[PDB]
Short mmCIF file of C-alpha atoms in Angstrom, two decimals:
data_model
loop_
_atom_site.label_atom_id
_atom_site.label_comp_id
_atom_site.label_asym_id
_atom_site.label_seq_id
_atom_site.Cartn_x
_atom_site.Cartn_y
_atom_site.Cartn_z
CA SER B 147 73.04 218.46 52.63
CA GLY B 148 74.24 214.78 53.01
CA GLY B 149 76.59 215.59 56.26
CA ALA B 150 80.96 215.58 55.67
CA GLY B 151 81.24 212.79 53.32
CA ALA B 152 78.75 214.47 50.56
CA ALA B 153 80.36 218.49 50.99
CA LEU B 154 83.70 216.91 50.56
CA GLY B 155 82.44 215.21 47.22
CA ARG B 156 80.76 218.28 46.62
CA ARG B 157 84.39 220.40 47.02
CA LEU B 158 86.69 217.59 45.08
CA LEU B 159 84.48 217.44 42.11
CA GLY B 160 83.89 220.55 41.26
CA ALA B 161 87.59 220.75 40.90
CA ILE B 162 87.75 217.73 39.04
CA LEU B 163 85.44 217.78 36.46
CA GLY B 164 85.86 221.83 35.84
CA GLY B 165 87.78 222.46 33.23
CA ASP B 166 89.08 219.85 31.22
CA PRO B 167 85.39 217.27 30.80
CA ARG B 168 86.86 214.28 29.29
CA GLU B 169 89.71 213.54 31.27
CA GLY B 170 88.47 215.22 35.00
CA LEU B 171 85.33 212.85 33.82
CA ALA B 172 88.16 209.10 34.33
CA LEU B 173 89.54 211.06 37.64
CA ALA B 174 85.86 211.30 39.13
CA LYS B 175 85.49 207.94 38.07
CA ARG B 176 88.59 206.99 39.52
CA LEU B 177 87.80 208.49 42.60
CA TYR B 178 84.82 207.24 43.41
CA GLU B 179 86.88 204.15 42.90
CA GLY B 180 88.70 204.77 46.01
CA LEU B 181 86.20 205.50 48.28
CA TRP B 182 83.93 202.65 47.36
CA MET B 183 86.54 200.42 48.54
CA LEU B 184 87.16 202.34 51.63
CA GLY B 185 84.73 199.73 53.10
CA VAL B 186 85.37 196.26 51.59
CA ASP B 187 88.78 196.85 50.75
CA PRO B 188 90.68 199.29 52.78
CA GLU B 189 94.66 198.54 51.30
CA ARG B 190 93.10 199.31 47.74
CA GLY B 191 90.93 201.98 48.77
CA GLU B 192 93.87 203.95 50.30
CA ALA B 193 96.15 203.14 47.25
CA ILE B 194 93.84 204.20 44.40
CA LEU B 195 93.07 207.50 46.54
CA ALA B 196 97.03 208.00 47.16
CA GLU B 197 96.57 208.07 43.20
CA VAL B 198 93.78 210.15 42.73
CA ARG B 199 95.29 212.56 45.46
CA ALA B 200 98.94 212.73 43.85
CA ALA B 201 96.84 213.78 40.50
CA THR B 202 94.62 216.69 42.35
CA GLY B 203 96.75 218.19 44.64
CA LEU B 204 93.63 218.47 46.84
CA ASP B 205 95.54 216.36 50.10
CA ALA B 206 93.51 217.95 52.71
CA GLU B 207 90.22 217.03 51.15
CA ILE B 208 90.89 213.77 50.00
CA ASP B 209 92.56 212.75 52.93
CA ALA B 210 89.74 213.91 54.94
CA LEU B 211 87.20 212.55 53.05
CA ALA B 212 89.22 209.12 53.92
CA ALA B 213 88.40 209.78 57.21
CA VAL B 214 84.41 210.57 57.14
CA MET B 215 84.42 207.56 55.23
CA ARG B 216 86.29 204.94 57.50
CA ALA B 217 84.13 206.14 60.22
CA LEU B 218 80.83 205.78 58.29
CA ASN B 219 81.87 202.49 57.07
CA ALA B 220 83.54 201.79 60.55
CA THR B 221 80.86 198.33 60.76
CA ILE B 222 81.77 196.90 57.12
CA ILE B 223 85.86 197.47 58.32
CA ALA B 224 85.26 195.71 60.89
CA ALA B 225 83.40 192.76 59.58
CA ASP B 226 85.57 192.49 56.76
CA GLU B 227 88.88 192.46 58.73
CA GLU B 228 87.45 189.79 60.75
CA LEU B 229 85.70 188.29 58.03
CA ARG B 230 89.64 188.32 55.96
CA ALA B 231 91.62 186.64 58.71
CA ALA B 232 89.43 184.07 60.28
CA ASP B 233 88.19 182.84 56.33
CA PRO B 234 90.68 184.55 53.44
CA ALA B 235 88.35 182.32 50.86
CA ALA B 236 85.02 184.03 52.12
CA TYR B 237 86.47 187.44 51.92
CA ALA B 238 88.60 186.53 48.44
CA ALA B 239 84.70 185.53 46.89
CA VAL B 240 83.14 189.04 48.42
CA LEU B 241 86.12 190.59 46.65
CA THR B 242 86.00 189.77 43.86
CA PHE B 243 81.93 190.28 43.68
CA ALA B 244 82.35 194.10 45.13
CA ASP B 245 84.70 194.59 42.04
CA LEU B 246 82.92 193.21 39.43
CA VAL B 247 79.68 195.02 41.11
CA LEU B 248 82.14 198.10 40.78
CA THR B 249 83.25 197.80 37.66
CA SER B 250 79.72 196.51 36.36
CA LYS B 251 78.77 200.08 37.50
CA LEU B 252 81.79 202.42 36.46
CA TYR B 253 83.44 200.76 33.73
CA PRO B 254 80.75 198.03 31.67
CA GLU B 255 82.79 197.77 28.71
CA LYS B 256 84.72 195.84 30.61
CA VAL B 257 82.55 193.59 31.66
CA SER B 258 81.44 190.29 29.69
CA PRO B 259 78.11 189.20 29.30
CA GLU B 260 78.34 186.13 31.81
CA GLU B 261 80.22 188.81 34.39
CA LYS B 262 77.44 190.85 34.33
CA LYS B 263 74.57 188.37 34.76
CA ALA B 264 76.55 187.23 38.03
CA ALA B 265 76.81 190.55 39.13
CA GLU B 266 73.15 190.81 38.52
CA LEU B 267 72.62 187.65 40.35
CA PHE B 268 74.90 188.33 43.37
CA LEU B 269 73.39 191.72 43.75
CA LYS B 270 70.00 190.40 44.10
CA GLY B 271 70.98 188.00 47.01
CA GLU B 272 73.00 190.65 48.90
CA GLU B 273 69.58 192.32 48.75
CA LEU B 274 67.32 189.49 50.19
CA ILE B 275 69.99 188.63 52.80
CA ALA B 276 70.21 192.70 54.17
CA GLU B 277 66.04 192.26 53.78
CA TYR B 278 66.02 189.05 55.86
CA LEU B 279 68.49 190.61 58.30
CA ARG B 280 66.00 193.78 58.79
CA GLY B 281 62.55 191.58 59.09
CA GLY B 282 61.91 190.05 56.40
CA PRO B 283 60.34 186.46 56.05
CA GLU B 284 62.96 183.21 56.35
CA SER B 285 62.60 182.33 52.31
CA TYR B 286 64.38 185.51 51.82
CA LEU B 287 67.45 184.10 53.05
CA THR B 288 66.55 180.85 51.30
CA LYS B 289 66.24 182.74 47.67
CA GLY B 290 69.27 184.58 48.40
CA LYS B 291 71.31 181.84 48.83
CA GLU B 292 69.86 180.38 45.70
CA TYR B 293 71.29 183.40 44.31
CA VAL B 294 74.94 183.85 45.48
CA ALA B 295 75.43 180.01 44.59
CA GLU B 296 73.98 180.90 40.57
CA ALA B 297 76.44 183.92 41.24
CA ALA B 298 79.60 182.04 42.51
CA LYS B 299 79.03 179.03 40.45
CA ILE B 300 79.23 181.47 37.12
CA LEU B 301 82.42 182.91 38.32
CA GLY B 302 83.76 179.80 39.51
CA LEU B 303 83.77 180.53 43.37
CA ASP B 304 82.81 177.51 45.52
CA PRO B 305 78.90 178.51 46.81
CA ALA B 306 79.64 177.72 50.53
CA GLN B 307 82.46 180.28 50.82
CA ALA B 308 80.45 182.41 48.67
CA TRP B 309 77.78 182.31 51.07
CA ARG B 310 79.68 182.86 54.22
CA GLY B 311 80.91 185.80 52.67
CA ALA B 312 77.90 187.22 51.12
CA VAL B 313 76.37 186.58 54.75
CA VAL B 314 78.73 188.24 56.71
CA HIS B 315 79.81 191.20 54.76
CA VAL B 316 75.76 192.01 54.56
CA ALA B 317 75.42 191.82 58.02
CA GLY B 318 78.86 194.44 58.70
CA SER B 319 76.30 196.95 56.40
CA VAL B 320 72.74 196.51 57.87
CA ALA B 321 74.56 196.81 61.43
CA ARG B 322 75.45 200.57 60.17
CA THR B 323 72.86 203.20 61.59
CA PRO B 324 70.64 205.02 59.41
CA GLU B 325 72.56 208.18 60.28
CA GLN B 326 75.54 206.16 58.42
CA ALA B 327 73.41 205.17 55.72
CA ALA B 328 71.70 208.39 54.83
CA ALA B 329 75.12 210.02 54.83
CA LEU B 330 76.35 207.40 52.10
CA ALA B 331 73.50 207.46 50.41
CA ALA B 332 74.15 211.76 50.00
CA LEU B 333 77.36 211.19 49.29
CA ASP B 334 76.67 208.76 46.41
CA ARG B 335 74.16 210.88 44.69
CA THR B 336 76.44 212.71 44.89
CA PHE B 337 78.84 211.25 42.60
CA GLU B 338 76.32 209.83 40.28
CA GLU B 339 74.88 213.12 40.08
CA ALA B 340 77.91 215.25 38.91
CA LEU B 341 79.16 212.08 36.79
CA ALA B 342 75.92 212.56 34.69
CA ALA B 343 76.35 216.30 34.43
CA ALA B 344 79.88 215.08 33.25
CA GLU B 345 78.33 212.59 31.02
CA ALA B 346 76.35 215.09 29.18
CA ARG B 347 80.05 217.25 28.01
CA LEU B 348 82.78 214.65 27.85
#
């Protein structure tokens, strides 16, 4: 039991994947899309969740889960909001990377070989930034920058702007408490697994 987020996820997923497990699988994925976006891009996340709320009728639970997410990702939202306002070019690079990562994970067929490679490279760069911030050797930051710059080059983004955005965004994520990170990981596990079982029915 992962906390409020996972409890609300269990309820919502049971209703969506119950009955039609083909058009329910697509709705469940779209719900995950909205929740994942609340941190990095609140306007985009709320839009998708509004769509899903109109499709399912589970107003109380979707509205409540949005609130839990804003709480769990409060440090990421604040960091990314200041980043957007101070540095729209850097924030545009993180929005691009985030949308690429989410699509690589939910709808891999929508991703080309190069963009998929950029997604892998960026995620390795993000990991090294985060583990620098969590105590790793300074060479983690050097190598992290090499990954981000190469992913930026692939996508035609400017590496200096991509890097600013990546470091600020990761810093906002690393600043979550371990309780918040555990809650988010529990919600994440809830989705990945219910979507596994619904990948056996289809």
